[PDB]
Amino acid sequence: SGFRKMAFPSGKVEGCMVQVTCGTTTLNGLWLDDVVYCPRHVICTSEDMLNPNYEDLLIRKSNHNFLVQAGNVQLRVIGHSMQNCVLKLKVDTANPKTPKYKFVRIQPGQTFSVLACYNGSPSGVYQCAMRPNFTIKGSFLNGSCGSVGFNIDYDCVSFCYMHHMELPTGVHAGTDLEGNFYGPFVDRQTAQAAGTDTTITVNVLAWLYAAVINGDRWFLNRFTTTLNDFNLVAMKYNYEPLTQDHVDILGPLSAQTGIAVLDMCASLKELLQNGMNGRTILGSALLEDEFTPFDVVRQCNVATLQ
Amino acid sequence: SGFRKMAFPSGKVEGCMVQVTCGTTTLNGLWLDDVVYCPRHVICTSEDMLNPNYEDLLIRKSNHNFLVQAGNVQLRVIGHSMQNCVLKLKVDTANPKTPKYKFVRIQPGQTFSVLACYNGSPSGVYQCAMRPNFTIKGSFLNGSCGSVGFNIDYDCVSFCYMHHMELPTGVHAGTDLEGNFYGPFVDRQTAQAAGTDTTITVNVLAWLYAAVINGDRWFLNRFTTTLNDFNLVAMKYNYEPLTQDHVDILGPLSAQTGIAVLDMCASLKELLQNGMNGRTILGSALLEDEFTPFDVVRQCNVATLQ
Ligand code: NA
C-alpha cells in the first residue's frame, strides 16, 4: 500500500555523468560511448549570450578548449560538433558503463526522472511531468545545466530531457537529446514566452484511481457524465480536454476498480465545482496531475491478473 | 529556483541489492563486503509467522537453505547468524561494488531515501521522513521486504532503514541495519497499533523558510510569540513541541531570510488557527512536514557565504 512520487533508480545514468568546462563555464555532460552531449551555451561569454552566433562561436573553438572530467580522469576531446542546441564532443575513450539507450521526445503530460547534477556529479533524483506549456517545475541551481531526464523502459534507458534554462518565473526549460527545445524557447538571454499552464486531466483521473486502489474513497459519487459535458466543466477550471484516447488509457484502472471512467469524471467534476471539503486524497490537499496512468498501474501492481 | 521532494542518487545502493530466498519466501538483501543482510522473517512459514521462535527456527536451517542471487549469479552461503531482527548470511565472495558505508539509527523528523526493490532488483526511489510514531508513509508491495533507506555523505552511504512490514493501516515499519525496529513493533502477525502520528513542527518551519526564499511571503505577519505560547497552540493541533534545540537548527534559515524563528512561529500559529483561506504555499495546500532544515539549506543554496 501507499502512493509516492517515485523516480527510477538512477545508477545507469550516474555512470554517464561528466563535467564539461569551456572557458570559465562549467556544467554537466552525458557520456555515451565515445561522445559527450551537453548544452551548447557552455561556449558563450556574457556578451555572446545576449545575441549568440553559435555557428561562428563553435568554429572559433578548438578541441583543447573543452575540458571533460569523468571523476578524477580527464577525457581527451578529439572532435566537436553541434546538433541544434546540444554540443557533441567526441572523446578518445568510450564509456564502458554506457547503458542500452535511446533518445526519445516525450509529449506533454508524460513523466520522467530527473538526475540533478553539479560539477559532473549526481546530486539528487526526482520525478517530473512535462507541463502542457512545455516547461517543467523542477528544483535546480546554477551549475545544473546538462542534467538529464529519462525513463527506464524494460532494459533500455530512454533519455528525454537535457536541462538548459530557468525562466524568470522559476520554471525550467530544456531540450530533447537531439537538442530541440520543448516549447517555444531559445538558449539565449531574451524574452521567453511560456504558454499558460493547464492541468493534465488524464493524470488527475489516474491519481483518483490510485486513491481508490489505496482505500481513499470519500470523494466518489454515484453519478456519471458524458465526455462532452465533462469537458465543458473542466475547461472552465483550466483543465486540458479529455479525449477518447485518454479514456482508453485509463481503461486498466477503470477495470481494476470497476468504476467507469465517465463515473470518475463526474466525481472529479464535483471536486472542481465544490472543492475538497477540507480533506486530503493520498496525503494531498490539492488534485495531483504529475502521475500518468502507467505510473499508477506500476506503483499499484494493477497489471497482475491474480 | 524551485523546491521538490528529492532523493539521493541510488546507484551506490543498487550495486548492493540481491535476492534472498528461503523455502518459498523471496525478498531482498543488502550485500556489503562478504555479508548479506535481510529481514529474518524470510525463514518463516505461514504458521511460524503467527508465533515465531526465531532462535529455534534458525537452528533447523542450514547454509544450503538460503539461495542468494546477485543478478543471474548465485552466491555461496557459508554462514548464517541473527542480529536482532536481521539475518546476516556470510557469503564466499565480497561484493566488489561495496561503497564506503556506515549503519546509523535516525531520529523522527529525519528524512532518507528509500530504494524500493523486488526480486533483488531496484524498482524506484523516493524520499520519506521517519514519523514521530516511528512509522514511514511509504509505497511498498509484497516482495519489498529488505528494501533499504539511506542518506549519502559525499562518498559514504549511511544506511538507516531496512523494510520489514506494512501495518493494516497502510503505513510501514522496519529496522535499522543492526536489526532493531524503529518503534514498538515486532516481526510477527499480531496486533501492534502505532502511536498517534503528530506533525513535525521544526520541519514545517523549515519548509515555510523554503517558501520565503522562493518568493512565497503572503503568510508572514506582524504578530509575535514566545516559544511557550507557540507550543501551547501547536500542541492543540497534534504538533510536536518546538524546543530551543529546534530553534538553533533553524538558525541558518532565519539568518538567510532575516526572519527570526519566533516570528516565523507567529506565522505558523495563525495558519494553524485559521487555515490558508484558499491559498497555497510552494504548490501545496497543506503544511508540509517531511523536509528537514538541511533539506531546505541544500535545495535553496543557503550554505554559501557569497
Ligand atoms: Na461518479
Author numbering:
A (entry chain A), B (entry chain B): 1 to 306
What does the paper say about this structure?
The main protease of SARS-CoV-2 (Mpro, also referred to as 3-chymotrypsin-like protease or 3CLpro) is responsible for the majority of nsp processing, cleaving at 11 conserved sites along the polyprotein including self-excision of Mpro by autolytic cleavage of its own N-terminal and C-terminal autoprocessing sites. SARS-CoV-2 Mpro is a functional homodimer of two symmetrically disposed protomers that are each 306 residues in length (33.8 kDa). The active site of Mpro features a Cys145-His41 catalytic dyad, which orchestrates nucleophilic attack at the carbonyl carbon of the invariant P1 glutamine and the formation of an acyl enzyme intermediate central to efficient peptide cleavage. Using C-terminally substituted Mpro chimeras, we have determined X-ray crystallographic structures of Mpro in complex with 10 of its 11 viral cleavage sites, bound at full occupancy intermolecularly in trans, within the active site of either the native enzyme and/or a catalytic mutant (C145A).
Unlike the C145A mutant, obtaining crystals with the C-terminal P6-P1 substituted sequences bound in the wild-type catalytic Cys145 active site was more difficult, with only two examples observed for the C12 and C13 variants. Finally, an additional product complex has been observed in the C13 WT crystal. Interestingly, in this case, the electron density unambiguously shows the Cys145 γ-sulfur atom to be oxidized, resulting in an even more dramatic steric/electrostatic repulsion of the product carboxylate out of the complimentary oxyanion hole (both oxyanion hole hydrogen bonds lost as well as the stabilizing interactions with His41 Nε2 and vdW contacts with side chain of Asn142). Remarkably, despite this significant displacement from optimal binding, the P1(Gln) side chain remains bound in S1 with its side chain vdW and hydrogen bonding interactions maintained, as well as the P2(Leu), illustrating again the anchoring power of these positions and importance in Mpro substrate cleavage. C6 (form 2), C10, C14, and C13WT have also crystallized in space group P21 but with a distinct unit cell, two molecules in the ASU, and a unique conformation of the donor substrate (we term here form 2 - see also below).
